Scaffold this motif. Sequence first.
Motif, PDB file in Angstrom:
ATOM      1  N   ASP A 121       0.709  -1.323   0.012  1.00  0.00           N
ATOM      2  CA  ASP A 121       0.017   0.018  -0.090  1.00  0.00           C
ATOM      3  C   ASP A 121       0.725   1.232   0.032  1.00  0.00           C
ATOM      4  OD1 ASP A 121      -2.486  -1.286  -0.190  1.00  0.00           O
ATOM      5  OD2 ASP A 121      -2.589  -1.714   2.092  1.00  0.00           O
ATOM      6  N   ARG A 122       2.226   1.224  -0.615  1.00  0.00           N
ATOM      7  CA  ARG A 122       2.898   2.232  -0.654  1.00  0.00           C
ATOM      8  C   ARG A 122       3.540   2.349  -2.056  1.00  0.00           C
ATOM      9  NH1 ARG A 122       6.597  -0.453  -2.101  1.00  0.00           N
ATOM     10  NH2 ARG A 122       8.381  -1.309  -1.047  1.00  0.00           N
ATOM     11  N   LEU A 123       3.648   1.065  -2.796  1.00  0.00           N
ATOM     12  CA  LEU A 123       4.036   1.104  -4.104  1.00  0.00           C
ATOM     13  C   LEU A 123       2.808   1.518  -5.131  1.00  0.00           C
ATOM     14  CD1 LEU A 123       6.171   0.133  -6.197  1.00  0.00           C
ATOM     15  CD2 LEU A 123       4.962  -2.024  -6.493  1.00  0.00           C
ATOM     16  N   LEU A 124       1.604   1.251  -4.752  1.00  0.00           N
ATOM     17  CA  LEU A 124       0.760   1.841  -5.672  1.00  0.00           C
ATOM     18  C   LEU A 124       0.490   3.281  -5.308  1.00  0.00           C
ATOM     19  CD1 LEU A 124      -1.595  -1.305  -5.978  1.00  0.00           C
ATOM     20  CD2 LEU A 124      -0.048  -0.408  -7.655  1.00  0.00           C
ATOM     21  N   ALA A 125       0.902   3.768  -4.060  1.00  0.00           N
ATOM     22  CA  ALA A 125       0.838   5.030  -3.736  1.00  0.00           C
ATOM     23  C   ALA A 125       1.794   5.907  -4.591  1.00  0.00           C
ATOM     24  CB  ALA A 125       0.939   5.278  -2.347  1.00  0.00           C
ATOM     25  N   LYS A 126       3.034   5.419  -4.572  1.00  0.00           N
ATOM     26  CA  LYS A 126       4.192   5.845  -5.222  1.00  0.00           C
ATOM     27  C   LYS A 126       3.708   6.053  -7.052  1.00  0.00           C
ATOM     28  CE  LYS A 126       6.657   7.449  -2.059  1.00  0.00           C
ATOM     29  NZ  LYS A 126       6.868   8.942  -1.885  1.00  0.00           N
TER      30      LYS A 126
ATOM     31  N   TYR B 277       1.418   8.667  -7.255  1.00  0.00           N
ATOM     32  CA  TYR B 277       1.915   9.972  -7.290  1.00  0.00           C
ATOM     33  C   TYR B 277       2.845  10.359  -8.331  1.00  0.00           C
ATOM     34  CZ  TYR B 277       5.000  13.854  -5.299  1.00  0.00           C
ATOM     35  OH  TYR B 277       5.704  15.269  -5.110  1.00  0.00           O
ATOM     36  N   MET B 278       3.172   9.193  -9.234  1.00  0.00           N
ATOM     37  CA  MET B 278       3.878   9.533 -10.302  1.00  0.00           C
ATOM     38  C   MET B 278       3.005  10.001 -11.623  1.00  0.00           C
ATOM     39  SD  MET B 278       6.688   6.404 -10.876  1.00  0.00           S
ATOM     40  CE  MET B 278       8.386   6.488 -10.034  1.00  0.00           C
ATOM     41  N   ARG B 279       1.788   9.315 -11.287  1.00  0.00           N
ATOM     42  CA  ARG B 279       0.499   9.487 -12.650  1.00  0.00           C
ATOM     43  C   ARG B 279      -0.153  10.740 -12.232  1.00  0.00           C
ATOM     44  NH1 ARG B 279      -0.960   9.233 -17.700  1.00  0.00           N
ATOM     45  NH2 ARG B 279      -3.058   9.164 -18.021  1.00  0.00           N
ATOM     46  N   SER B 280      -0.266  11.138 -11.010  1.00  0.00           N
ATOM     47  CA  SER B 280      -1.251  12.363 -10.766  1.00  0.00           C
ATOM     48  C   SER B 280      -0.201  13.481 -10.477  1.00  0.00           C
ATOM     49  CB  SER B 280      -1.935  12.254  -9.417  1.00  0.00           C
ATOM     50  OG  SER B 280      -2.780  11.019  -9.689  1.00  0.00           O
ATOM     51  N   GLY B 281       0.803  13.388 -10.015  1.00  0.00           N
ATOM     52  CA  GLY B 281       1.899  14.644  -9.864  1.00  0.00           C
ATOM     53  C   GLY B 281       2.657  14.904 -11.209  1.00  0.00           C
ATOM     54  N   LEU B 282       3.362  14.026 -11.439  1.00  0.00           N
ATOM     55  CA  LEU B 282       4.247  14.243 -12.876  1.00  0.00           C
ATOM     56  C   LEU B 282       3.818  13.864 -13.985  1.00  0.00           C
ATOM     57  CD1 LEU B 282       7.480  12.539 -10.945  1.00  0.00           C
ATOM     58  CD2 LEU B 282       6.883  14.977 -11.073  1.00  0.00           C
TER      59      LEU B 282
END
Lengths: 274, 276, 271, 259, 257, 271
Positions: B135-140, B143-148
């Motif tokens: 539940d932190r791999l899909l969070a990162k 954060y890649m897809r939404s932020g960057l």
Amino acid sequence: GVVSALSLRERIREHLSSSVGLLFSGCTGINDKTLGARGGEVIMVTSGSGMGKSTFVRQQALQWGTAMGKKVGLAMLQESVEETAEDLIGLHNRVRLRQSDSLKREIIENGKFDQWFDELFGNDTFHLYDSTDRLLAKLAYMRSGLGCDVIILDHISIVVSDERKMIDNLMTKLKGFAKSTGVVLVVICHLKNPDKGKAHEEGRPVSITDLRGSGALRQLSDTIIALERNQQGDMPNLVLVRILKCRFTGDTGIAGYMEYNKETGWLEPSSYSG
Amino acid sequence: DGVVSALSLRERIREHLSSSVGLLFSGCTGINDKTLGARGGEVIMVTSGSGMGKSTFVRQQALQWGTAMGKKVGLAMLQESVEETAEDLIGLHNRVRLRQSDSLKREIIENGKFDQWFDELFGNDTFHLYDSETDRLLAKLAYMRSGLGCDVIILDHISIVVSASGESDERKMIDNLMTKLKGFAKSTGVVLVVICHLKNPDKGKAHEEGRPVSITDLRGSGALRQLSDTIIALERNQMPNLVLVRILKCRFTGDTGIAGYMEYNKETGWLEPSSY
Amino acid sequence: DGVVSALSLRERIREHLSVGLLFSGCTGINDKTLGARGGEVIMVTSGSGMGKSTFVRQQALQWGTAMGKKVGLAMLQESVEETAEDLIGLHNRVRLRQSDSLKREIIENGKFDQWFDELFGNDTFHLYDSTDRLLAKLAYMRSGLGCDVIILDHISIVVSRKMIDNLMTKLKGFAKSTGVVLVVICHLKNPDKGKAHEEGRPVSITDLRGSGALRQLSDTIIALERNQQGDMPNLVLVRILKCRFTGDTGIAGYMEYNKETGWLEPSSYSG
Amino acid sequence: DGVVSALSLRERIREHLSVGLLFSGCTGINDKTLGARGGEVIMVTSGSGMGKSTFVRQQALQWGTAMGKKVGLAMLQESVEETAEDLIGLHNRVRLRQSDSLKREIIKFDQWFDELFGNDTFHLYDRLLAKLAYMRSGLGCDVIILDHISIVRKMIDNLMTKLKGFAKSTGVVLVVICHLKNPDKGKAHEEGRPVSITDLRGSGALRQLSDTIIALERNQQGDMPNLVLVRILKCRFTGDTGIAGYMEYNKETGWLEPS
Amino acid sequence: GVVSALSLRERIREHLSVGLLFSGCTGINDKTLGARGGEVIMVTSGSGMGKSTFVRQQALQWGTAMGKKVGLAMLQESVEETAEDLIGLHNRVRLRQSDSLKREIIKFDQWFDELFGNDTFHLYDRLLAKLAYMRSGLGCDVIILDHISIVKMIDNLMTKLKGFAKSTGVVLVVICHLKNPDKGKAHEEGRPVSITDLRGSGALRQLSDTIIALERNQQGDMPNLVLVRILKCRFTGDTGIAGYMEYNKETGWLEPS
Amino acid sequence: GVVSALSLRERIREHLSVGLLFSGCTGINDKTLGARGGEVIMVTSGSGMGKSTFVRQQALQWGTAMGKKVGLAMLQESVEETAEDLIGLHNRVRLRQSDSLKREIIENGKFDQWFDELFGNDTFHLYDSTDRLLAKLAYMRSGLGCDVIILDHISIVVDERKMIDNLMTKLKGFAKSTGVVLVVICHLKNPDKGKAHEEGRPVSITDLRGSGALRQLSDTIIALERNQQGDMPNLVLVRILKCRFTGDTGIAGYMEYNKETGWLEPSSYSG
DNA sequence: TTTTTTTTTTTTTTT
Ligand SMILES: Cc1cn([C@H]2C[C@H](O)[C@@H](COP(=O)(O)OP(=O)(O)OP(=O)(O)O)O2)c(=O)[nH]c1=O
Ligand SMILES: Cc1cn([C@H]2C[C@H](O)[C@@H](COP(=O)(O)OP(=O)(O)OP(=O)(O)O)O2)c(=O)[nH]c1=O
Ligand SMILES: Cc1cn([C@H]2C[C@H](O)[C@@H](COP(=O)(O)OP(=O)(O)OP(=O)(O)O)O2)c(=O)[nH]c1=O
Ligand SMILES: Cc1cn([C@H]2C[C@H](O)[C@@H](COP(=O)(O)OP(=O)(O)OP(=O)(O)O)O2)c(=O)[nH]c1=O
Ligand SMILES: Cc1cn([C@H]2C[C@H](O)[C@@H](COP(=O)(O)OP(=O)(O)OP(=O)(O)O)O2)c(=O)[nH]c1=O
Ligand SMILES: [Mg+2]
Ligand SMILES: [Mg+2]
Ligand SMILES: [Mg+2]
Ligand SMILES: [Mg+2]
Ligand SMILES: [Mg+2]
């Protein structure tokens, strides 16, 4: 957290001139297609039963300790501490120490035992381990607390003793401990039973899927080295080295031949041509 | 509710079959004839044996998508650290092997050619990496897809996130991770490459000796071949460089089978197309 | 109490006996299972890529246009626009999504809206756009819309053996209570020895993932096998595994695929 | 106390020892286990679609026309109308719910209805233990058949102890149907695999608390899908187990008949 | 359990030179030295293997050959059936299975009194007080219990039974059932029983004193050729295959062959 | 557990300042160098080719002639039978082969002469019958102060692969860091093709049944071959199959079986 | 703070 590719300008630079291969001894066909061993580089070593896995890795540990300056830490679990220490002393002095009571009784009385001791352990380069979660913590204190450069483990099946889940989790934890640390990790595992035909101790050519316990040992290791010798044939001291898997280079196959010297205990590069 | 009448759904279809579709592969021609590229919301799963080119072929694909096409590409490479995978791409872009030679590393240290080869590739924000509990791999990844805003996300070595967490049964965690991963892919509409291994065959030859990999040979579950949209298998016999491609399951078209052949150039590191 | 003697049952039998929803492709299905019936649960079984959703999409088309019956699709495996485009292309005999030279052609030619209300003109087709919420939405399709056929594409991602037994009992209770023809699609297990199903191995009724009550509570099972890496990956074989309302089971027929159009159409193939 | 000597028992044995309910089709059952008896629990088990409920519905018919005993059916699997329409079609030698022309041709419907419901024999069922106690006390049921146990380890053991206690208290012939387990290696049961006594879902009480077990095996996807093999797995009264005989189905009629 | 070399000073001489006996395949009491008081003897096998038949045959042969007071507990059936079975087993004629002979012989009191003329048997249709009464106020030296499957709650029961047997000194036979095999064959088609196959808990083999088991290929070539296994014997230690019995369907006696 | 090599200045010196040799055959002695603290010796043969005979013979020769405490745990037979075997083999008779000899020894009081000649020196210990076994063997080694421990018939002691793997791991880890010669008797698996083990097949290293851990945790492996149907049925062949200390394996020597005293003598067979 | 059934997936051996 995630990283941005413009902050890697200062660290890929620092990684560029830091990586450095540590050569193997006994055979030069291994070094030409491995380029050594690096920091964060798990090396699996395997053979049949009694074919020479601990002697080979002990010779490698001897050569990396007195000839290259690398601080070597062992975790030999087949044997005790003083047994492998006396085998290291007898191997560095090019004799066969423990297999002769006459020489052991001779060298203890003429006072040259401290001469054979301080030529190795004077610099404090070798380190030993005294016998799942406590093992890796003591390896972490072996690495960061002391400062060793190569860490060797032997006979992995003590740690698992469902085996496949535990051996997969263990191999993952050892690969993750090797990465982000800067230490070569030498790991020794055995081979399952042959299904039909002859056996691995009679000289059957080892394949990659015989690493017993799972298939997850050949999928988390970088370099896989296999030894094989035919103790029933004509020449029972002619080992063959086969690189089964090499991730950094991609060169695999028959490295070369070696010959074992029964009087000194050194296996040395042979000139055998098939 | 969520029950849709198929009469009050016109405008969406008018903005669906107008615009996307494309984003072809590289290295082999016959792959792009069958799968017709990689699409948003899909899952592409690439399999081979051990050390058989399931990271080299994917880095050689991520170079061609992130440089020659301007797509922002993210790499969750969990086999190696960020310092080696960002350094093999420089050698692959400049057609050398930078890690496999200590002479060329010293040469680019001395004269300053390293800054040229670094700002040629990493000048535009296209490659987004990560260095390292699911539940932190899909969070990162979110954060890649939404932020960057990566357009192609590559998750390498899914077997390291099923074995770094304490779970009793392995199959249920694989199925739950795979369905949450497909849900993230269909929600965000990002191309998602997944890399996983194969299991031990019962008898006969092995996968590193020329075994034709079937779709049942995926290691871990049966949820791998049932929740992915494109499956690519790379097969060689260590002619130890001739790698051939099999399409195992394309949900979009119906073409599956022997795609073609590739070859590996030893001095540069590229997958050139072959002829046989 | 809830006891009913068999003598006082002359009326309710009289209103119960005073063929069914036929199929499309491989004419030995409704020869064998005599079509679908109200209040059944039908399982469509195959391996991956063998054309399960491809087979059931065609039946949703033939039961929504030629028969006029209110059809409700529930494609949890995909979205609503993709299955809507596939229905439009399937009725218009042109493989729509797999050709981009025509997707922008028909939207500036103006005949997209000619193709849209030709088949979506009635209030027939109702779609589901993504467990208790799934049952409440199927109930809202049944009560608030009056659907005659309800199709469910993927049973597995409903699951977050006991949770599958409870699911199959609750769906069978819903189908028996409301009398709606319910089609549910499921997948097969990984066999231990030999080929996979995708290389043309025939499917047994044991091969059902999750539990074994998937065969104990459905009324018929239709399996499709196609040799994917073979000489023809288009010819499928249809095997009826269970039939509780007639009894006859076995190999029914064959459907070639006709790659230009996309219609599973029947063929002649003896042995 | 409840202690009784063996000497003070000459009365209650003398009234006791002065075969039971036979079966129709596969005449090596009542040859082997001597038919059904009071107080028992009987298990008819096979795979899905093997023809369990057809067999037990044929027995429910033949124990209510030639015998005259009050038969109580409990078909929780289907509706009360279908299980009566099948009995009407089975008695009248022509299959009812499959020929759609005849369903409106007969509507001599009341002539077929009263010919088999002219007595007050059959009783259908539209908590379950209380309903069976009602069917036993207020209605005089001699046979009770139950088709669906599944929605009704520990909560299956308690149910089977309670059913055996009810059967012991009332002296009723009691047939219970449950399904087979999922075999983990080898073929399915539906291609002619012989059934072991392990093959029972839930727990092990289904073989420990019953009195006889009958199994039907037929090669469903084969050349002869209409030939059941009947196997006795247990019999507390005799011990005679094994392969009994062979029944053909005769699709035209619906009657399991021997050959 | 570690025995020194001095402790066999006279006991090897003891090799150089019992209690209640069993019936059929006489290597039972040749191996466990017969039954004894204070014991808890378990007869455990699969369903249909003949546990109740075996223990009922022994109940008959301990009440006509020895004359000891025998108490039965056949909670698997009623008190009339278990008496008709004893009469039919003694008179060499299968009684409850032959429909004609049940009304032909009703000489019924002649067959009754010849085997029930003493005060030997004590039948049964809270339970601990009943067992204590059957011991004390009735003189029963053998007590048999056929069904424990309906009576932590099994561990408490077995400790209470073993404390009762320790306090009294009575031959006690208790029958329970096996567990479900997870892989391979079942116990009824010729799979040999291990000591682990016991339901409920694990104290059934830790608070007992000897364990007998039967194996026969029930759906097989010859279902009437049993094999007897000793699984535990605290006195002797001699375990394993004991002997062979055929059932003789016309008579009902497990006779050796 | 973290050990620096500087503190081993006096421990290694204590370790330098011992093989226990095999009797009845000098050919085993030529390529094993005896047995040191932590020397697991696996012994096997065919179906009844004399495992317990040879191992009990070595236990007899190590106890009454060299002054070492030998602890037997024979589980093929009980305590009295192995004591009868010890005394009747040490007194060179065939004790259990005739009932006339067992009666003569008890009428003249010469049995009590035979207890004093063996069991009076306390150089032997027995065992009366898996995690209940190692805590007894640990007290046998540490509390009594023995040097050789023998375990027999591993097949009753032990998915029968994880059990024997954990057993062999526990016994090897017990033999290490304690200083005992742990003789372990195992069996061979059944031959599939070729000639059987009753006919004189050359034994292989991979016939240790149960797992592969029986040849991967041993220190020495000894096998016996005897052709009970051939020309000399009283001739055994001793073959070393694994040695960690030296590494010299092969045909060690020959011994001859005797039908007069029960013993087996060194032979001089030529080929 | 203990014991029994159901089921999908990876390895090591057995007559
Ligand atoms: C390499 C080699 C070793 N030897 C001898 C010397 C070694 O001390 C002995 C094997 O010792 P080890 O190498 O320590 O044994 P192993 O690790 O191969 O096997 P295992 O751990 O399962 O016991 O074999 C040879 O005779 N010829 C050879 O070629
Ligand atoms: C495809 C291919 C690669 N190679 C080289 C390229 C790389 O240096 C190396 C492959 O390294 P990787 O790409 O890292 O190996 P992998 O991803 O296939 O599998 P794993 O991570 O489990 O080890 O082999 C060849 O030599 N011949 C070939 O045909
Ligand atoms: C039936 C059939 C399908 N196909 C192709 C055309 C369809 O676009 C493609 C998609 O197949 P699907 O119908 O989507 O297959 P599936 O639903 O059973 O598999 P899954 O949902 O697990 O992914 O299959 C053929 O090529 N030949 C055929 O005979
Ligand atoms: C015995 C037999 C049955 N049949 C068919 C005809 C009947 O319509 C059909 C009866 O189906 P059912 O007996 O009702 O199926 P089932 O009760 O075993 O399954 P479930 O668990 O869902 O209750 O069996 C044959 O065709 N040939 C045969 O020999
Ligand atoms: C031992 C044996 C019994 N039988 C028959 C005779 C009996 O009437 C029948 C039943 O044996 P029972 O001893 O009555 O079985 P059981 O009461 O112990 O069963 P459970 O407790 O599991 O419910 O078996 C044989 O046919 N052959 C045999 O070898
Ligand atoms: Mg070793
Ligand atoms: Mg890789
Ligand atoms: Mg689908
Ligand atoms: Mg039914
Ligand atoms: Mg009984």
